[PDB]
Amino acid sequence: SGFRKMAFPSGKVEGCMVQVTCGTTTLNGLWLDDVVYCPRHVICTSEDMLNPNYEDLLIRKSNHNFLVQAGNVQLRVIGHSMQNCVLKLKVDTANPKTPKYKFVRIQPGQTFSVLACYNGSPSGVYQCAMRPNFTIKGSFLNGSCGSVGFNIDYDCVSFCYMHHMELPTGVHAGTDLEGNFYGPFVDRQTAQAAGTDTTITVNVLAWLYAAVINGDRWFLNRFTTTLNDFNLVAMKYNYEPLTQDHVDILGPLSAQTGIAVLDMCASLKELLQNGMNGRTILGSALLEDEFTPFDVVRQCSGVTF
Amino acid sequence: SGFRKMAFPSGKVEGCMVQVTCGTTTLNGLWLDDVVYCPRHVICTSEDMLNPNYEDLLIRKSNHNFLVQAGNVQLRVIGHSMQNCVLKLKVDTANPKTPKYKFVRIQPGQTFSVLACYNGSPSGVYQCAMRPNFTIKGSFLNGSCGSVGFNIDYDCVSFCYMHHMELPTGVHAGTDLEGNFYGPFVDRQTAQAAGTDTTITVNVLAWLYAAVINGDRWFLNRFTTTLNDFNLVAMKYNYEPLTQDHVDILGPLSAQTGIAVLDMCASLKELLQNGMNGRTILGSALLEDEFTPFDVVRQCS
Numbered sequence A: 001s002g003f004r005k006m007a008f009p010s011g012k013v014e015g016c017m018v019q020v021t022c023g024t025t026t027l028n029g030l031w032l033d034d035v036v037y038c039p040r041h042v043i044c045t046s047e048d049m050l051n052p053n054y055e056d057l058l059i060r061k062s063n064h065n066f067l068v069q070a071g072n073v074q075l076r077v078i079g080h081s082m083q084n085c086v087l088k089l090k091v092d093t094a095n096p097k098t099p100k101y102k103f104v105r106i107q108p109g110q111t112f113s114v115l116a117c118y119n120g121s122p123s124g125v126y127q128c129a130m131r132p133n134f135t136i137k138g139s140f141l142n143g144s145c146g147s148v149g150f151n152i153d154y155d156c157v158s159f160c161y162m163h164h165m166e167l168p169t170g171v172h173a174g175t176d177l178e179g180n181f182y183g184p185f186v187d188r189q190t191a192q193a194a195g196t197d198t199t200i201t202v203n204v205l206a207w208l209y210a211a212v213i214n215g216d217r218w219f220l221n222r223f224t225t226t227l228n229d230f231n232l233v234a235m236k237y238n239y240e241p242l243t244q245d246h247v248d249i250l251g252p253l254s255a256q257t258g259i260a261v262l263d264m265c266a267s268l269k270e271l272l273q274n275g276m277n278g279r280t281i282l283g284s285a286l287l288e289d290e291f292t293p294f295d296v297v298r299q300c301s302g303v304t305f
Numbered sequence B: 001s002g003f004r005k006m007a008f009p010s011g012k013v014e015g016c017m018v019q020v021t022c023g024t025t026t027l028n029g030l031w032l033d034d035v036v037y038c039p040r041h042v043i044c045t046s047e048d049m050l051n052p053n054y055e056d057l058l059i060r061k062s063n064h065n066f067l068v069q070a071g072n073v074q075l076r077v078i079g080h081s082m083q084n085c086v087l088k089l090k091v092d093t094a095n096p097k098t099p100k101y102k103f104v105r106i107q108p109g110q111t112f113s114v115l116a117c118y119n120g121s122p123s124g125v126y127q128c129a130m131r132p133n134f135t136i137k138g139s140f141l142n143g144s145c146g147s148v149g150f151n152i153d154y155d156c157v158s159f160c161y162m163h164h165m166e167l168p169t170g171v172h173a174g175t176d177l178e179g180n181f182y183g184p185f186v187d188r189q190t191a192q193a194a195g196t197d198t199t200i201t202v203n204v205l206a207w208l209y210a211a212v213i214n215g216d217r218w219f220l221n222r223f224t225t226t227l228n229d230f231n232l233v234a235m236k237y238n239y240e241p242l243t244q245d246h247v248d249i250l251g252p253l254s255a256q257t258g259i260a261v262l263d264m265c266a267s268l269k270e271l272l273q274n275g276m277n278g279r280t281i282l283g284s285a286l287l288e289d290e291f292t293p294f295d296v297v298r299q300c301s
């Protein structure tokens, strides 16, 4: 028993982290096969960021301008190209530690592990969710750009996020590994703000099921609700709409605990209208939304990688 | 910016996890150099749990009774010995992925990362703290025994915990890597209960400093307190006494934020008295105590 915010083991990703230096800027790169992926803003100066023409800045660069360091070994860049907001640096050496991998774009509500890096060296791993406003509530300092978000499926790493910037409110924005930003963000020094965030409803329900599996039942009630009545209530409390897809995904947890999804929805509705009343659920006084239904099953059943 | 519960990258530890089988029992082992460390209770049968005589049970075992598996390769056990509650299985191959490491015994309040494993395979990494009652609030299922707790400051892995058992309340007990249990626990099925747990006061203060560094100042007040008056108040909320050692440890954070330790203690007293009033601190509606002063400095600076 116990329920923790748990990240995937980061080993397969640690063996891919490298340091990328271009001019005065140093950030992280992801070395897979003979390619190093990193944010394209590494080519920018402070002035260039205000209004950058990345094609123009990149054409002026030569391969030797990019200093790639894997541990204490310098890699030689033999080519460079840009794919959306990611820079792809072709290197002469293929990473011998390249794991089985895929590039996947995730949807809001999905969780992933972040391997925070500085100077190509991993310093921490944490689990977070893609917020409905497309930001992530990460923990990043200067030099963290190029740090990646991932999930593991059996022995395959699915890279889903690359860190690019921090917004004024302290939240973070980035792209998938194809360089497409999550959210309406751009890699340019201009006024940008995260939209009003919402709670990931399906994840809160999954977490309430995790609490039931762990013996926390105080919030359960005899009531059920319709999906439409729940969505009318949930919308009032800035909660994401719960779809039939979400109800179906929660099915296995509903079968294991004996609590129907719409029955758990009525518990959630009462929690929203009345609060916790000085009580906690899984050591939290707030409803947690950064555990998906898959994360709960994985943790409460012990899937390994 | 941002403050997250952050674990160390687990790679150096993943390359050490192996599966140890003895009879019908399968658990995890830590393979460092030519030695596999695992809980000694792996040798116990059904009636060898209430009152096992581990020396007696171990003398009856041979090297070939221990089946050690590293990935899909079986390792050959060439010796076995017991050090307190840990079994040390000498193997014929030194782990090529052995990182720079040390065995460190930690004190209550200290934090560490746990690499939860099943059948010698890592499944997740999370952050823990050694509770003042010497238990850990982990997340472990059957088969997780032998999973380890560690810190990775620099390129060296400091192993501080090996998971041994789950207590009736769902909390976890284990040993350092020398086999010495944390707390008054024994590796027997005898009636054992975790003592009443308390809040790690110095860690809550470190977390309040993390919140100030991140721009959260609403809980600050114009008051200060004496160390003794703070402790008299804190103990009424089941908070650990704050010692002069703790006040000294909070010095660098105090200097960085400009808030004296006893000034932050008065904020904590006020929070205990009033609660949060619908407000949160670093995205939490409870006072967090699983970030040490060292964790806060590392994460913020």
Ligand SMILES: O=C(Cc1ccc(Cl)c(Cl)c1)Nc1cncc2cnccc12
Pocket: A041, A049, A140, A141, A142, A143, A144, A145, A164, A165, A166, A186, A187, A188, A189, A190, B001
């Ligand atoms: O904010 C930037 C650089 C940056 C700035 C503007 C633009 Cl338009 C872009 Cl694309 C990138 N990266 C940083 C990342 N994470 C945390 C950070 C904390 N402190 C500082 C920097 C941080």
Ligand SMILES: O=C(Cc1ccc(Cl)c(Cl)c1)Nc1cncc2cnccc12
Pocket: A001, B041, B049, B140, B141, B142, B143, B144, B145, B164, B165, B166, B172, B186, B187, B188, B189, B190
């Ligand atoms: O509790 C035991 C086995 C055990 C039992 C009694 C004694 Cl005296 C000893 Cl030393 C070891 N390990 C397990 C570890 N963690 C979570 C667990 C959840 N479910 C089951 C087992 C769990």
Ligand SMILES: [Cl-]
Pocket: B105, B106, B107, B110
């Ligand atoms: Cl310690």
